DNA sequence: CCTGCCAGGTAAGTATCTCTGCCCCGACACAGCCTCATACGCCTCACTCTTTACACACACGG
């Protein structure tokens, strides 16, 4: 298996992949986001995650 | 060492085509005009099942 598989096993089993886990600056940038790139209501959130990490 | 007539069987006959050279040809190019007929080709449009993404919802379980 090439290094490509053997990374995707890993990943779509990795766990560190996401944090699971929410903190009060992480609450603060999506506000933030949401605010900027809000439309009304149905934010897009693919377009928000791209500004975050994990 | 030859030679032949007669009975039986058979048989007629009538009545009721595939090449093969060979002269005397059509159809090729190609010229402008010209009108309508025929063919091709290509992109734009349609659509249709089958996923594809993505916000949202809703148990679920102990």
């Given at each position: ?6 990374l ?22 999506l ?13 897009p ?9 994990g």
């Open positions: 298996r090439s290094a490509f598989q053997c995707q096993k890993f990943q779509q089993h990795n766990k560190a992949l996401k944090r699971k886990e929410w903190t009060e600056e992480e609450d603060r940038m506000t933030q986001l949401v605010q900027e790139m809000r439309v009304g209501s149905h934010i959130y693919r377009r928000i995650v791209y500004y975050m990490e």
